[PDB]
Amino acid sequence: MDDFASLPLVIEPADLQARLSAPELILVDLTSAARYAEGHIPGARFVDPKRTQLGQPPAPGLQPPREQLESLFGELGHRPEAVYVVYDDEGGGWAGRFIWLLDVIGQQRYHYLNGGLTAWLAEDRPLSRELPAPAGGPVALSLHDEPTASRDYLLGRLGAADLAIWDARSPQEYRGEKVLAAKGGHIPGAVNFEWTAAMDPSRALRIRTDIAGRLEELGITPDKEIVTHCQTHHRSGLTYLIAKALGYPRVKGYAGSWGEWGNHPDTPVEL
């Protein structure tokens, strides 16, 4: 992992600024076309958040088809020596979903910029409006199912003693007060910890330093397989990232998410 090998998954703006010139670095920006043009971290390559999703029914939260992925990573310059540093400007949702995609394509070396652009801007660090040269054509990818939980898999795991379902939606959605699908409520046995509650607005949206204890209070512990989700696996991108960052050995993103679960005929719901 070269210059980044010594750093933990979640790194700080100072760690990144000092390594912006690393040759193996593939800095990924998942803010927005406007934000990216206005000013991005030097060397950052833009990946529109929509490009990280299938975007088609019945489950748009799923990963993009193989073709889109091969083209995307080909443009980013995906190569053997690559070390990814990911960031967004919303507290980590999209960045975390991208890291999940990195797991999906077998990438082993990557890091999350704690607080992303928010933290970077809060410390008035260097910005660029220049475009990095795209790598090239699409590259062949080895896709993995392990980082993801399918509807069938979760259905067969419900009630499991060694399973914790981290529902990252808002409390009102979890309780079925706000219904965005045919069925309201949550997955049976799931616990709720809104993605926004994992951020610290007083620290430029960095992951709250007391995050471990908060997850533990809800039974979301490393000794359990952690399956996380939201409405479309966006907000759960951050929660997925957090579990991995804390060293949780078994973590999966239920990409289908409530968009699927709340609408599927076979799925039981709980208030």
Experimental method of this PDB entry: X-ray
What is the radius of gyration, based on Cα positions, of the chain? 18
Distance CA 63, CA 150 (A): 12
Identical fold, 1-144 and 145-270: yes
What is the resolution of the experimental data for this entry, in Å?
2.0
Residue 92 near residue 199, CB atoms below 8 Å: yes
Active-site residue (options: 28, 205, 230, 242) = 230
Residue positions forming the annotated binding site for substrate: 235
CATH 3.40.250.10 holds for 1-144: yes
> How many Cβ atoms are within 10 Å of 123's Cβ, its own excluded?
13
Residue 175 designated active-site: no
C-alpha span between 264 and 256 (Å, rounded):
10
Cis bond leading into 126, ω under 30°? no
Strand ranges (E), 114-197: 163-167, 191-192
CA distances 238 to 104, 111, 197, 246, Å, are: 16, 13, 11, 12
Segments making up each domain of the chain, as ranges: 1-144, 145-270
Task: CATH number for 145-270: choose from 3.60.21.10, 3.40.250.10, 3.40.50.1010, 3.40.50.740.
Answer: 3.40.250.10
Distance from C-alpha of 180 to C-alpha of 171, rounded to nearest angstrom? 13
Nearest CA among 84, 119, 123 for reference residue 105: 84
User: Which residues are annotated as part of the binding site?
Assistant: 235
Which residues are within 8 A (CB) of 40 and not within 5 positions of it... i.e. 6 or more apart? 29, 31, 46, 117, 127, 128, 129
